[PDB]
Homo-oligomer: A and B are copies of this chain.
């Protein structure tokens, strides 16, 4: 399948933010996805000195959100039920600082108004990306501000860009871990729009629709990637005894209850493309965001079935958009 991108051995010892004169770089990745979703903008910035970065989804009007912080090792700030931005970043818990840069910028744009109903709400989540490089540089307040300032409608930089700079997969053993990236995908169906954004830094591996392992757990001794379960099961036989952060953004009106269950459904669906997933070693966090523009019909019928047009249906479609995004990240 694809050529290996082995991350290589941990190097710990390296310089931190203050050691450098750090210039934000607008991330372009390997290619740009273009899409049509008015009211949603995306910016991505990185420090070459990491390499590490942040990716910001800006919805200036604000949008209702559900968070499904399903992993065992989550790094989350805010996790609000209504957001003006979502900030995804490297740097482990230190990278939550990037969201502060976004928040301050939005406060300035609001002319420092502070009424309850005009608080600018930014939710942030992070990946641990320090094993995939040899510095301690992290996404700081300045980098989050830059990613917001770089945000534009209808573009997403695929691959090694923003939060995906140093994302990696397949962590049974660090000698077999491979660099991933970030990914996005978009579908429009009638008036319905669905955007998926993902930064897969899994303990598990990326798996395609045929069941092929396409990124992570690559053994240079064999030239082949293995599903982790094969390693795990042999490890048990031998010895006993002897994070992915993501967002799904849509324009379909969903109640708080529908939106929450939609988040759970889409998030669980990602165990198709990332295996294992939702593990104690992962901090998997999905944000489900709706711009509340399009009604679903009051009854769920169509020529395709009596129960074919509802939030579960939307969840199933969004799950496919998200798998496409995961595969873009691993490409």
| B236 touching A317, Cβ below 8 Å | yes
Q: Which segment, of A29-37, A55-63, A149-157, A296-304, faces chain B? A: A296-304
Residue A331, interface by CB 8 Å: no
Residue A326, interface by CB 8 Å: no
Residue A7, interface by CB 8 Å: no
Q: Which of B108, B240, B268, B307 contacts A309 (CB 8 A)?
A: B240
| B92 touching A96, Cβ below 8 Å | no
A210 CB → nearest B CB, Å: 6
| A78 touching B75, Cβ below 8 Å | yes
Scan A131-175; emit 1 where CB is below 8 A from any B CB, else 0. Answer: 000001000110000000000000000000000000000011111
On whether A277 and B256 interact (CB within 8 A), knowing A173-B305, A189-B237, the answer reads: no
Residue A329, interface by CB 8 Å: no
Interface centre among A120, A258, A309 (most CB of B within 10 A): A309
Give the CA-CA distance A275 to B75 in the complex, in Å.
29
Q: Which of B100, B231, B311 contacts A305 (CB 8 A)?
A: B231
Question: In the assembly, how many copies of this chain are there?
Answer: 4
Residue of chain B at shortest CB distance from A122: B93
| B312 touching A276, Cβ below 8 Å | yes
| A114 touching B100, Cβ below 8 Å | no
Size bin of chain A's contact surface: 35 or more
| A15 touching B305, Cβ below 8 Å | no
| A172 touching B308, Cβ below 8 Å | yes
A244 CB → nearest B CB, Å: 12
A75 CB → nearest B CB, Å: 7
| B316 touching A16, Cβ below 8 Å | no
Residue of chain B at shortest CB distance from A134: B114
Scan A190-217; emit 1 where CB is below 8 A from any B CB, else 0. Answer: 1110000000000110000111000000
| A269 touching B269, Cβ below 8 Å | no
Q: Which residues of chain B come closer than 8 Å to A239, judged between CB atoms?
A: 190, 297, 301-302, 308-309
Q: Which residues of chain B come closer than 8 Å to A292, judged between CB atoms?
A: none
Residue A278, interface by CB 8 Å: yes
A246 CB → nearest B CB, Å: 14
Residue A4, interface by CB 8 Å: no
Q: Which of B104, B173, B234 contacts A307 (CB 8 A)?
A: B173
**Which A residues, 106 to 130, have Cβ-Cβ distances below 8 Å to chain B?**
107-108, 111-116, 119-122, 128, 130
Q: Which of B18, B128, B203, B310 contacts A312 (CB 8 A)?
A: B203
| B116 touching A128, Cβ below 8 Å | yes
Residue A314, interface by CB 8 Å: yes
Q: Which residues of chain B come closer than 8 Å to A122, judged between CB atoms?
A: 93
11 contacts between A and B (CB under 8 A): A12-B113, A76-B79, A77-B77, A93-B103, A97-B100, A115-B130, A190-B238, A190-B239, A232-B309, A238-B304, A280-B310
A residues near B (Cβ < 8 Å) are 12-18, 70, 72, 75-80, 92-94, 96-97, 100, 103-104, 107-108, 111-116, 119-122, 128, 130, 136, 140-141, 171-176, 189-192, 203-204, 209-211, 228-229, 231-242, 255-258, 261-262, 264-265, 267-269, 271-272, 275-281, 294, 296-297, 301-317, 319-320
